[PDB]
């Protein structure tokens, strides 16, 4: 009875989109900081001197 028009759109996963950007323009990733212990006040640890 006629013609049907078909349009298909797929938005791929940006992380897997090689050869180009790997994220959206406004996708911001923040690295989680590492936790460390500061209490060692004097701590003059000595290495064997070299010359």
């Amino acid at each position: 009875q006629g013609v049907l028009g078909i349009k298909v759109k797929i938005m791929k996963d940006p992380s897997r989109n090689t050869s180009g950007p790997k994220a959206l323009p406004d996708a911001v990733t923040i690295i989680e900081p590492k936790e460390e212990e500061p209490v060692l006040e004097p701590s003059v640890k000595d290495y064997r001197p070299t010359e």
Binding site: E36, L40, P42, V44, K45, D46, T50, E51
Partner: protein, 320 residues
Amino acid sequence: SSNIMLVLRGTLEGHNGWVTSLSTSAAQPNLLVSGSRDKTLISWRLTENEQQFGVPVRSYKGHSHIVQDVVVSADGNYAVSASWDKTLRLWNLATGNSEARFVGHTGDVLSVAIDANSSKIISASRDKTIRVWNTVGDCAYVLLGHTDWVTKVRVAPKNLEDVDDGRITFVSAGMDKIVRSWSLNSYRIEADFIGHNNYINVVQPSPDGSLAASAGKDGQIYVWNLKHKSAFMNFDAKDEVFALAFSPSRFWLTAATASGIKIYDLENEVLIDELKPEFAGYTKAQDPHAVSLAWSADGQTLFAGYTDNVIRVWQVMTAN
């Protein structure tokens, strides 16, 4: 004892960014090289005539980004500039042209050090590495051992070590919250120093070369022995100490706090004087703090480079 007063005697206007670093040579007392955020070095000739304490001589253009640390040579004829373009530049203090362009740091260089003689250039950069160069321009050594940025590297002067050794000792520190000692000929590690709660902003060995003074974000200034490898003392500045400097004549530590400039008398373990210039039209919460400090060769004048793009000199005038 030692009722010593220091009074601002001149202001060295002419820069256009924060005067990040200063340097002075022992041989030439009337020359002062200062690098600023305006990507340029300026050489100043000091005049003992009237209000202005100095006179700019040459501006050293050729740096694309922020100029962080400036070091003059021992003879007083060459100056090495570290900038935020990941490159180092060697300048003839008279010609005004650059001699060498040290390249190789993947992060912008934060500090540079001159050898005791005119042999080696020591540079610290944001790429967690230290680089040892010849005067020609090539990089001889790539010292690692720091897991984070290295902000300051200044050489410990050899005073009387046995006679002579041909060994080159300096210190390094940054955002690793550690202070490291290095020895060169070969060109390997030395003892460590772990005292800082926060990360170290600046270190500066004593003029003799046996006391190392480190400072950080928390204002916790530490003084250590290098030849003895032990702590010497500890104070708190309770502000942001941006830079610090030993003094040649007196046994003193100038510290550039976020509020002003403290001076610590080392023998008495008590601060003696505080330096806060008088600005105008501010709100007292953002007064321009000091970022660069440098004493004179004798120990008579002090140069402080602020964030207001100005060098201010405090001359020591003992009012009895």
